[PDB]
Design a protein around this ligand. Structure first.
Ligand code: FAD
Ligand code: FAD
Ligand code: WLY
Ligand code: WLY
Ligand code: WLY
Lengths: 586, 587
């Protein structure tokens, strides 16, 4: 147990010191390493439950049982007198840099998970390389370091959402006494895009500065794993070479899918192109019904656009379907048009006008599920029909890394693949929620286990979400239909209520915002799922995710007192059950 | 044990049925009571763990151990055959209305706590009266049903806060691509006040309708408790009379204080006056440093006003002082002036308020600083926010025997009972309790259930979360850092903290003013003793964490929970810089 932990920690740590906080010989070794700029992990034996057992087990490696003991890449280097001797003789720098491999860690992919993993590993003395390359979109769009969220995901989409929310703030301001006239104000797309891209540029630069300051090697190159320890890299000049590493983290993410229909790749775009587009999309069709499709259609409508969404079957498949339909009803009431039960079968009428900075024109042909025909003209067609990895480009078949039927990596609960030195994090890890804070937690926690002897695993259960549609939807835990399937209808109680934000009163809807708690009767009314549709839904939901993590019950919500006036306080006084049939309106 | 719970429940309930869900004889009695419009509490014995023992103890009152059993005001009425005998003999209505008192419950005070208590009690067949009267301010301001929060408190102040927040929404919109020019837009006070007052009027009306539909008697009259069961009421025509009640709930709240200086009552105003003021205050002085003072100064500045705050000593006494200073620093950088370590000596009138042309007067304020230097400056409006106090002499005759504390608030047990066994107190007048609207509502509803439905649940007053709605909002739950250090010692306290920047603030162009921290106890598994956040939407951020803190959250619970991105709140899930480390908290 302890001995198996100690052997795993010594084998994989790059530079590690076993120590006690009160030992002045240990302080002397710490000061020499700091002076020589040698980064390392430290384990303070006097602060661990079984320090005495670990101290004994160390002798199986070093033949001594005292502290300090310093190791480099699995090899005992010395005690205090010995480390000082190497320092005085100018031999220490060469010893701590001796390695069978070029790097202790190679990260393939410089996004949310990979950057987090690489920076954390470098803190413990691991010699680290992060590779990042952005293959251009079909029309040629590309961007800088930081991954999908930073460049073409959470960051620009929430800034554009905020631009949309400000339209209603302008409307509300007249009712609260301000002299403006909303009807005479218009929106400039390119001014917004320039501000969004200036912020993204500051993030690209900030990540390169962070890697430099952590002594991480950044290679803007495409990587391919060709054997367990060998990574083939390809240059911006197409120069090909091979680097070796002890541990490998795969962190390459996903890219958007296109449907296999004529004209889709040639004449449509995806979210990858939208957030830097130099002209306003104009009259727009969004094909798809994911959170990406609905978030983009939502802000485009608030910015003044003529927007239609083509839905094959349902909205937000995999989310609670009562809440999904309330999300869509709000958008349809506030200007978004929906072509329901419909799929596309794209023709070009005008080429994009780079001269005068204007979109082209397209004819879209499709059909409804009953066979009736769809035919209509649009200036822009955005496909949001899912995302996928392309691990065939990243991973030679002969390495032995197992994939599932969707092409994602099959991992143990510590992110290990079927190849013992190779790990995977983020969107390519099969069966995990595909979210930026999950990829960051996974990468930081894994680096600590590899290079600092940590044991803590990432917990992937009950991870909260928020969909940033024009009225936002936050959730944590099970949908109501999933709870009933798992436990049976008679064991599920649902408390629910409508509400009206106080900010909406003077601004003139009464009963559109909504929240519910899905509970298990036979387990002390445990809260299985929380759902809220309303303003600031992500800020509302986050704190409750801690309480659900700790096993909150309905009684825990009841005994906590509300903060007034807020939207969130409605969760503390819920009482109407769905079984009662009583109306949830206010 | 069980037996004296049953005794209390039977003595106190107005109309209560002991039942079982599968009993068809109980179903017939229920349906009879519903047809006759008789409201009542119900105890289903087949659902309580010791319902067997309760069945036995019922015999001590009724000499039977079967179900159903109906009681009215402590007297056994009958089983199924006997209840139906009374119904078809036209004898039931008289029996269920027989009472020694005019009412089962009299609530003195129609505000947050009193309206909640009265409505909940009526749901169980208690015959209930709610008394409310609003004594006018010195300049004559008055308002309708619903109490301090509804009329001159949480509701209008947060609406005026939102009007102020929309000024920065207008500035931000230009950076996000909208074509407006913020510099050419102005604010109209009276248009605001009309919208705010129209919403308050809808709440006044809604409460009157709610009381009518619950069969609660509403008396717009001043109440005075003259003996344990007698309440003297005074009419709008000065008519005096007396009504009697079994249980009494005191829920009369507080009103603003004035300093004892010349000119204060005559020429200044309070928050009672501000929210319906018919003219814009103009150049304004706020005297005091409570959350009322700072919230009001904040929105007046954001609406374009010239605003000064006169501070005797510190800001937000009783709140975390690191956070209080950050709140004030933001206000001073965004257009609120502060006269620090300063108190007033007199208000002199220079110009009388012009009712016709709808304009303020003009005043001269004289004061001095703590070192001895002098203060002298003219203002159009002077607002006093130097605390609030109850006036229980008006409400409560000394001979009744209800004990007060040295501040004049009612001394109560943990179930809100006073020193007089049938009299209870809730809300701001209950000594030692947090003075907040959702506390008063929970106390009132929970008390009503114990009195008339045999409930046992008490109100929990610990770790109640708060939010100060200053221009940059401040949310908190639990201990301040200084209180935790005093309680446990500095070596046993660890503080994790960080600055943050809302994503919404990036394109709009400050980096390091929003701030959050967790104050934790090392020797108790790093228990979270207090949570603090300064930033936008701070009440929405804080609320959910109050459930986790109620449940005993540790730092490890915050670490294992995953963030929602992009939000301000997610910064709580990845905190790692400690104050003891000396590492900077900036972004
Ligand atoms: C429109 C949109 C909105 C989103 N909004 C949110 C949101 O609000 N909240 C949220 O939590 N999540 C959101 N997400 C999801 C979030 O973007 C992802 O979960 C996250 O980016 C996954 O990080 P990752 O490290 O797994 O991969 P990525 O961030 O995609 O990083 C992988 C990187 O590796 C590079 N790469 C690929 N192949 C190679 C190779 N062979 N060699 C070198 N480099 C390579 C890629 O080009 C990329 O830069 C959104 C996603 C999209 C598309
Ligand atoms: C400016 C301001 C802002 C506030 N903001 C907030 C906030 O954001 N959040 C929050 O939680 N709290 C806030 N509060 C506090 C909140 O208003 C109080 O905690 C709450 O109103 C107290 O409720 P109560 O039932 O005890 O008394 P009240 O609501 O004051 O009701 C008592 C009622 O009884 C009446 N009455 C008095 N004497 C008699 C009598 N003899 N006969 C008949 N009727 C009588 C009073 O006139 C009044 O109508 C604020 C308070 C102020 C002043
Ligand atoms: C067509 C096109 C245009 C611009 C860019 C940006 C760039 O400079 N990419 C550098 C990578 C490193 C490996 C191959 O190219 C890429 C592709
Ligand atoms: C606005 C809006 C748009 C689209 C939808 C989805 C839809 O058409 N749902 C019906 C399906 C058929 C199978 C089960 O329910 C809802 C709401
Ligand atoms: C903007 C603003 C205004 C007022 C204050 C309070 C103050 O003046 N503090 C000085 C010393 C420190 C403790 C006692 O007084 C702070 C910040």
């Amino acid at each position: 147990g302890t001995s198996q932990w100690l052997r795993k920690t010594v084998d994989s740590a790059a530079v590690i010191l076993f120590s006690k906080t009160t030992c002045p010989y240990c302080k002397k070794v710490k000061d020499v390493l700091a002076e020589a700029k040698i980064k390392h992990a430290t384990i303070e034996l006097d602060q661990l439950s079984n320090g005495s057992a670990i101290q004994k087990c160390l002798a199986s490696f070093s033949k001594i049982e005292t502290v300090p003991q310093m190791f480099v890449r699995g090899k005992f280097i010395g005690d205090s007198q010995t480390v000082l001797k190497y320092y005085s003789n100018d031999e220490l720098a060469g010893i701590v840099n001796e390695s069978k491999y070029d790097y202790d860690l190679i990260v393939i992919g410089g996004g949310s998970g990979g950057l987090a993993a690489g920076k954390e590993a470098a803190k413990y003395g691991a010699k680290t390389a992060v590779l990042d390359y952005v293959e251009p979109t079909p029309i040629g769009t590309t961007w800088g370091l930081g991954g999908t969220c930073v460049n073409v995901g959470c960051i620009p989409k929430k800034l554009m959402h905020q631009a949309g929310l400000l339209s209603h703030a302008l409307e509300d301001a007249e009712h609260f006494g301000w002299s403006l006239d909303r009807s005479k104000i218009s929106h400039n797309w390119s001014t917004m895009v320039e501000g969004v891209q200036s912020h993204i540029g500051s993030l690209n630069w900030g990540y390169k500065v962070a890697l430099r300051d952590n002594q991480v090697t950044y290679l803007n190159a495409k990587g391919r794993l060709i054997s367990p320890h060998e990574v083939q890299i390809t240059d911006k000049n197409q120069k090909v070479s091979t680097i070796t590493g002890n541990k490998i983290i795969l962190a390459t993410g996903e890219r958007p899918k296109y449907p296999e229909i004529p004209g889709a790749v040639e004449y449509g775009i995806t979210s990858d192109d939208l957030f830097s587009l130099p002209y306003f999309p104009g009259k727009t069709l969004v094909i798809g019904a994911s959170y990406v499709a609905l978030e983009c259609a939502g802000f485009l409508a608030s910015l003044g656009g003529d927007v239609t969404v083509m839905v094959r079957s349902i909205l937000l498949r995999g989310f609670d379907q009562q809440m999904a339909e309330k999300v869509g009803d709000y958008m349809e009431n506030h200007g978004v048009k929906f072509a329901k039960l419909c799929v596309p079968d794209i023709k070009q009428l005008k080429v994009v006008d780079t001269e005068n900075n204007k979109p082209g024109l397209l004819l879209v042909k499709g059909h409804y599920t009953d066979g009736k025909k769809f035919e209509e003209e649009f200036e822009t067609v955005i496909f949001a029909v899912g995302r996928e990895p392309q691990l065939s480009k990243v991973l030679c078949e002969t390495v032995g890394v197992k994939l599932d039927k969707n092409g994602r990596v099959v991992c143990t609960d510590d992110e290990q693949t079927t190849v013992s030195n190779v790990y995977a994090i983020g969107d390519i890890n099969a069966g995990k929620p595909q979210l930026t804070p999950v990829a960051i937690q996974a990468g930081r926690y894994l680096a600590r286990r590899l290079f600092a002897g940590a044991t803590e695993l990432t917990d992937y259960s009950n991870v909260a979400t928020t969909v940033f549609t024009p009225l936002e939807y936050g959730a944590c835990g099970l949908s109501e239909e999933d709870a009933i399937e798992k436990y049976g209808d008679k064991d599920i109680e649902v408390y629910h209520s409508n509400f009206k934000p106080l900010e909406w009163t003077v601004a003139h809807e009464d009963n559109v915002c909504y929240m519910k708690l899905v509970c298990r009767k036979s387990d002390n009314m445990r809260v299985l799922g929380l759902h809220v549709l309303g303003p600031n839904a992500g800020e509302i939901t986050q704190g409750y995710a801690v309480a659900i993590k700790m096993g909150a019950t309905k009684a825990d919500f009841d005994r906590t007192i509300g903060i007034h006036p807020t939207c969130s306080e409605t969760f503390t006084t819920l009482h109407v059950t769905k079984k009662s049939g009583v109306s949830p309106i206010v």
